[PDB]
Design a protein around this motif. Sequence first.
Motif, PDB file in Angstrom:
ATOM      1  N   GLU A   1      -2.427   4.287  -3.976  1.00 37.38           N
ATOM      2  CA  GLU A   1      -3.701   4.540  -3.310  1.00 37.38           C
ATOM      3  C   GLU A   1      -4.540   5.538  -4.106  1.00 37.38           C
ATOM      4  O   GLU A   1      -5.774   5.488  -4.087  1.00 37.38           O
ATOM      5  CB  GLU A   1      -3.448   5.070  -1.894  1.00 37.38           C
ATOM      6  CG  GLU A   1      -4.698   5.414  -1.076  1.00 37.38           C
ATOM      7  CD  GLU A   1      -5.571   4.207  -0.775  1.00 37.38           C
ATOM      8  OE1 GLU A   1      -6.204   3.685  -1.714  1.00 37.38           O
ATOM      9  OE2 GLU A   1      -5.625   3.781   0.402  1.00 37.38           O
ATOM     10  N   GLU A   2      -3.866   6.436  -4.815  1.00 37.78           N
ATOM     11  CA  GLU A   2      -4.546   7.446  -5.614  1.00 37.78           C
ATOM     12  C   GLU A   2      -5.230   6.930  -6.875  1.00 37.78           C
ATOM     13  O   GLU A   2      -6.169   7.561  -7.363  1.00 37.78           O
ATOM     14  CB  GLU A   2      -3.561   8.550  -6.002  1.00 37.78           C
ATOM     15  CG  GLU A   2      -3.318   9.570  -4.901  1.00 37.78           C
ATOM     16  CD  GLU A   2      -2.025  10.332  -5.093  1.00 37.78           C
ATOM     17  OE1 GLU A   2      -1.561  10.427  -6.249  1.00 37.78           O
ATOM     18  OE2 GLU A   2      -1.479  10.839  -4.090  1.00 37.78           O
TER      19      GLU A   2
ATOM     20  N   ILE B   1       0.868  -1.170   0.000  1.00 42.62           N
ATOM     21  CA  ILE B   1       0.000   0.000   0.000  1.00 42.62           C
ATOM     22  C   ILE B   1       0.908   1.224   0.000  1.00 42.62           C
ATOM     23  O   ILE B   1       1.667   1.431   0.950  1.00 42.62           O
ATOM     24  CB  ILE B   1      -0.873   0.047   1.267  1.00 42.62           C
ATOM     25  CG1 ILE B   1      -1.774  -1.187   1.329  1.00 42.62           C
ATOM     26  CG2 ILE B   1      -1.715   1.319   1.279  1.00 42.62           C
ATOM     27  CD1 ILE B   1      -2.582  -1.276   2.609  1.00 42.62           C
ATOM     28  N   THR B   2       0.835   2.021  -1.067  1.00 48.58           N
ATOM     29  CA  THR B   2       1.649   3.226  -1.194  1.00 48.58           C
ATOM     30  C   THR B   2       0.768   4.400  -1.611  1.00 48.58           C
ATOM     31  O   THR B   2      -0.334   4.219  -2.142  1.00 48.58           O
ATOM     32  CB  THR B   2       2.761   3.056  -2.252  1.00 48.58           C
ATOM     33  OG1 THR B   2       2.169   2.930  -3.552  1.00 48.58           O
ATOM     34  CG2 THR B   2       3.596   1.806  -1.955  1.00 48.58           C
TER      35      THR B   2
ATOM     36  N   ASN C   1     -12.729  -5.595   2.132  1.00 49.31           N
ATOM     37  CA  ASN C   1     -12.133  -4.980   3.310  1.00 49.31           C
ATOM     38  C   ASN C   1     -12.677  -5.608   4.587  1.00 49.31           C
ATOM     39  O   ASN C   1     -11.925  -5.929   5.504  1.00 49.31           O
ATOM     40  CB  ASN C   1     -12.410  -3.479   3.334  1.00 49.31           C
ATOM     41  CG  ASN C   1     -11.722  -2.789   4.493  1.00 49.31           C
ATOM     42  OD1 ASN C   1     -10.500  -2.854   4.619  1.00 49.31           O
ATOM     43  ND2 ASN C   1     -12.503  -2.128   5.349  1.00 49.31           N
TER      44      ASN C   1
ATOM     45  N   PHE D   1      -7.476   0.115  -1.881  1.00 46.49           N
ATOM     46  CA  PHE D   1      -6.749  -0.854  -1.067  1.00 46.49           C
ATOM     47  C   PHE D   1      -7.565  -1.202   0.171  1.00 46.49           C
ATOM     48  O   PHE D   1      -8.136  -0.324   0.815  1.00 46.49           O
ATOM     49  CB  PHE D   1      -5.414  -0.274  -0.583  1.00 46.49           C
ATOM     50  CG  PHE D   1      -4.288  -0.398  -1.561  1.00 46.49           C
ATOM     51  CD1 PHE D   1      -3.692  -1.632  -1.804  1.00 46.49           C
ATOM     52  CD2 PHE D   1      -3.776   0.731  -2.196  1.00 46.49           C
ATOM     53  CE1 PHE D   1      -2.597  -1.741  -2.660  1.00 46.49           C
ATOM     54  CE2 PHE D   1      -2.686   0.635  -3.054  1.00 46.49           C
ATOM     55  CZ  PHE D   1      -2.093  -0.605  -3.285  1.00 46.49           C
ATOM     56  N   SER D   2      -7.620  -2.483   0.506  1.00 46.07           N
ATOM     57  CA  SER D   2      -8.321  -2.899   1.711  1.00 46.07           C
ATOM     58  C   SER D   2      -7.340  -2.568   2.835  1.00 46.07           C
ATOM     59  O   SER D   2      -6.207  -2.175   2.568  1.00 46.07           O
ATOM     60  CB  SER D   2      -8.543  -4.407   1.698  1.00 46.07           C
ATOM     61  OG  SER D   2      -7.296  -5.078   1.796  1.00 46.07           O
ATOM     62  N   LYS D   3      -7.764  -2.708   4.086  1.00 43.49           N
ATOM     63  CA  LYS D   3      -6.835  -2.470   5.184  1.00 43.49           C
ATOM     64  C   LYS D   3      -5.771  -3.544   4.974  1.00 43.49           C
ATOM     65  O   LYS D   3      -6.046  -4.581   4.366  1.00 43.49           O
ATOM     66  CB  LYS D   3      -7.520  -2.662   6.536  1.00 43.49           C
ATOM     67  CG  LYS D   3      -7.896  -1.363   7.228  1.00 43.49           C
ATOM     68  CD  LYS D   3      -8.951  -0.601   6.469  1.00 43.49           C
ATOM     69  CE  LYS D   3      -9.242   0.732   7.143  1.00 43.49           C
ATOM     70  NZ  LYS D   3     -10.374   1.430   6.477  1.00 43.49           N
ATOM     71  N   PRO D   4      -4.547  -3.323   5.471  1.00 43.77           N
ATOM     72  CA  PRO D   4      -3.510  -4.343   5.269  1.00 43.77           C
ATOM     73  C   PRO D   4      -3.797  -5.719   5.868  1.00 43.77           C
ATOM     74  O   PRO D   4      -4.369  -5.828   6.950  1.00 43.77           O
ATOM     75  CB  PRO D   4      -2.259  -3.686   5.860  1.00 43.77           C
ATOM     76  CG  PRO D   4      -2.811  -2.780   6.922  1.00 43.77           C
ATOM     77  CD  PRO D   4      -4.037  -2.188   6.262  1.00 43.77           C
TER      78      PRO D   4
END
Lengths: 262, 262
Positions: free
Chosen positions: A97-98, A92-93, A235, A102-105
């Motif tokens: 992300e833009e 996740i960067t 997520n 992304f789901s939570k890690p």
Amino acid sequence: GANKTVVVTTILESPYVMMKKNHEMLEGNERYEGYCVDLAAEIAKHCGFKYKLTIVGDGKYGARDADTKIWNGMVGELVYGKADIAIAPLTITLVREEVIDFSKPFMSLGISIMIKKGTPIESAEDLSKQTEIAYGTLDSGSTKEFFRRSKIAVFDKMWTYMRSAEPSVFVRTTAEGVARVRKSKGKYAYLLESTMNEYIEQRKPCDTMKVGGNLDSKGYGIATPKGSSLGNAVNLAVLKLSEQGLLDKLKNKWWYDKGECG
Amino acid sequence: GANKTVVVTTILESPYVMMKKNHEMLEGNERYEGYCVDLAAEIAKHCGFKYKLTIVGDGKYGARDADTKIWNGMVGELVYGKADIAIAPLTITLVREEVIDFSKPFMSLGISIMIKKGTPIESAEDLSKQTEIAYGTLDSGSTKEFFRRSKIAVFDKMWTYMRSAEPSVFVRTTAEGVARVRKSKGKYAYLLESTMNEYIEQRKPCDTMKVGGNLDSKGYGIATPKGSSLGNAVNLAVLKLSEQGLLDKLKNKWWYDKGECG
Ligand SMILES: Cc1cc2c(cc1S(=O)(=O)N1CCN(C)CC1)S(=O)(=O)N[C@@H](C1CCCC1)N2
Ligand SMILES: Cc1cc2c(cc1S(=O)(=O)N1CCN(C)CC1)S(=O)(=O)N[C@@H](C1CCCC1)N2
Ligand SMILES: N[C@@H](CCC(=O)O)C(=O)O
Ligand SMILES: N[C@@H](CCC(=O)O)C(=O)O
């Protein structure tokens, strides 16, 4: 409308996704095994969808070309609609992300140093203050971007060296970086995520090891195209799996349960 | 419409948010100091909003009453519109994710065991297999819910004991749990998040310590009311701060830079 078979993009990276020894005897999803293979099954079950695992065409994680602004790797497959979801050790960067969700890690990690046993290196600072031992990172990934974008003295120094080092210190796959560490008699050190570093340390010939503390702290997330209706359920599924201790169980299964170095 | 001053709900929990020694001499935000105070300033700057720090009225993190279904603590302040955002060591959980939005985690942690030095306990299993040493958790938080909902043998056993233990092994604040550990001559152990455990271990009288590995793995996230227009910018800000190494810098500042136990 009607539910469709979800196209999952992933990458051949041990022990997340690996070709089963007898893959030629199998079809579709059965061909693969690994942490992300098991995770994909769990996510699919909790979200109620059927899926098809596909290996990213160019074998890359995902980076944007500074000129064309075109994304490659798994990130690109999601951005350009080739895949509906990415289930792999995708970091996740901010830049990612833009353009994708992304789901939570589902797993945490940090950049780390891999050396051949006996190498006189204990930290990133050690590496930056010498030249006898070469060191690099994976291409088209978050680790390389980390060094390229860092304003932290030691990492800036390392990047300055790596970017103009000859021969190139960068590799196309993790397996290549590991092979270089193993066959360079201690003259090459590899910068990779602690997760992959830890896995390799438990694989024969047991000649590598992680040294020093992690350079940063982040995690992998399941990615979907921006705005995808799948994001929400995925997520929540990640959180449930986390809370049930399933994620921890899967990491132990693929990392230590069958470690080959005692 | 016109930008409004963002009402931030947080909680007095060391070293996240603490009353400055001279708070009576100060006004508003200046009254407080800590990791989340500094974090709030950073987030606000990157998102472009001005804010007002407020301490959660009931001093709780957030739990839903099984009967009334009413949420209390910081979670409740967000759900019922009393606050616009929560910036505190608020654990990302499934039940909470469903009613409020969470940014990616800004700090990772896991449930851990705090003992008074010398206590003959090394693990959760040790605790579960004995009765001489009492042990409990914080009320209205994620740790208590973890044990209440666990189907893992050892944790189930622990919960079974804690829920009916007399006198009560549960406490209203972390400070209370720590005080009980310190004044119970080793007859009480406290289950709390590794982050808080680690901080306390570096505080005088230096008579406590974290033992054993973390029981789980999760993180804290900045929370906003579900659908809040603030969520997006806040999430991106967290990632930027993470990538710049600012988060790591803040944790060192409040945890170890000025540790009091050498
Ligand atoms: C099991 C697990 C769960 C989990 C994470 C990592 C992991 S881990 O496999 O990476 N875990 C890290 C700590 N290690 C000692 C054991 C493995 S995480 O921090 O990246 N994401 C969190 C979820 C839960 C709330 C925050 C997102 N859960
Ligand atoms: C500095 C930091 C950044 C960070 C996380 C924890 C932390 S940490 O302060 O908890 N870090 C954990 C490891 N420890 C050795 C140093 C402190 S996290 O895993 O909870 N969230 C991640 C962001 C970055 C991508 C995933 C969300 N960054
Ligand atoms: N997980 C990284 C790849 C591995 C690395 O860069 O070290 C990514 O998502 O780009
Ligand atoms: N961080 C926890 C509180 C501390 C604990 O439960 O141990 C929560 O958000 O509920």
